Symmetry: C3
Subunit: 132 residues, 3 copies
Amino acid sequence: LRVAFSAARTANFAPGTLDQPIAFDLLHTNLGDMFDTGSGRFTCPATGAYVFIFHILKLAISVPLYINLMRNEEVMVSAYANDGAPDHETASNHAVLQLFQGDQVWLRLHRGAIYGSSWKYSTFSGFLLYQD
Amino acid sequence: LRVAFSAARTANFAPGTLDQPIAFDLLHTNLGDMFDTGSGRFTCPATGAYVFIFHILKLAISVPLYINLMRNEEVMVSAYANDGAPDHETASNHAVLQLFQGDQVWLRLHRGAIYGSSWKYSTFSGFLLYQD
Amino acid sequence: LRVAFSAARTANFAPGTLDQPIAFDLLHTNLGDMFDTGSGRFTCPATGAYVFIFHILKLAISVPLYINLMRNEEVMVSAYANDGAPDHETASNHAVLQLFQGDQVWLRLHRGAIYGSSWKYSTFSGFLLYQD
Ligand SMILES: [Ca+2]
């Protein structure tokens, strides 16, 4: 199988409620058709090891940015960014995860707000490394 | 094909004109010989999906750092970093891109200035994920 | 061979001596059994090209964070993070390295202190790209 996605958000996300999934409207690639832009979820099509990377730019507001990489309902890794000016700042992390078919991987906006524009600062990608 | 590069800049880049390509003088790997240090460009040797990652440390000056990952003449993803002290800060992003043979991928210094030293803070890498 | 690890630190690291290796207590994956949590070292099981990524969150103290990605006793790439508030900040980088069997890759805390918690902000991963 060839499975890879690379997504970006081109409009801000500032929902007004904590702990929301982050949709990504734009895709550069979606090999395998397993990323869903509206929900922001990647669905595992085949048990195996997958690599994920994300970079999220915060709005220049005095609220810190907290991002979680979720697998189903579990926090796998997290990222923090804040600047007191307040200026933009970037919350980023990565993971290599063992997934089972049907598992979903997604980013949660725990706190803060996300910058989106056509220059695609805020991104989320993943790819299949080893298929079972 | 085996295609992968991992480059670093070991001297500062502060050109004095906006929107300049970023050369990377040092290579840890250049499997496939497709990265050119002088131009900072990766040339696609075979249509396929490629992964790119970059981390760029800014000079501690009161000019923000804006980096674009370019494919040919198009902005694919971007990164921002700034600190008001001013301190060093890091502009980073990644992408998984569908490339065609002959396409070129490179980093553009939109604004700001880059820190280079022998400890290799400022880096740019890529590798072939799926060959067509 | 299938070789990949993805580690996180869930407790702080503030050793009180500069230039210390960083242990990572938690693993999401350790395909090939080549990451050692206590030493923080990945041992190369087979000559080839390997990808490494790390994201390290600093303690909110007025000491900057400097991280080196080491191969044996050599600095390969480095990362810096600091914020004057002082706030948390993230030191991150990546590399694609040609390794020989027996080589060890690890992260060095040059200066600063690392934040660890159950939300897994501070991470280190690697995987085999091309086996010789
Ligand atoms: Ca930062």
